[PDB]
Amino acid sequence: NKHQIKQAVKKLYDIDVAKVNTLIRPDGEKKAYVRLAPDYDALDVANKIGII
């Protein structure tokens, strides 16, 4: 759920989360849009993770 996803993202990537939206894709996977805090650049964080 959104609480668990937010906590997991915070712990794994050492960042702050503004909010989390979730959907369940028509292939059965759950997709989460994690909006980060304004003081965090999602582009730099994505580069740290490996994407983009």
């Binding site: 369940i24 894709r25 028509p26 292939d27 059965g28």
Partner: protein, 47 residues
């Protein structure tokens, strides 16, 4: 308007509607030549 169970059934039925990988045709004892394909109009799901 769907339930979670119906949607999961539909997702599984969607993930099964793909062609066989081509490299499976190269195996030593392969008898398959193509895929149990389902079309939304030609055959209806068990619902």
């Amino acid at each position: 308007h769907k339930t979670f169970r119906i949607k999961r059934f539909l997702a599984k039925k969607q993930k099964q509607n793909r062609p066989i990988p081509q490299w499976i045709r190269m195996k030593t004892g392969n008898k398959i030549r193509y895929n149990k394909r389902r079309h939304w109009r030609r055959t209806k799901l068990g619902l």
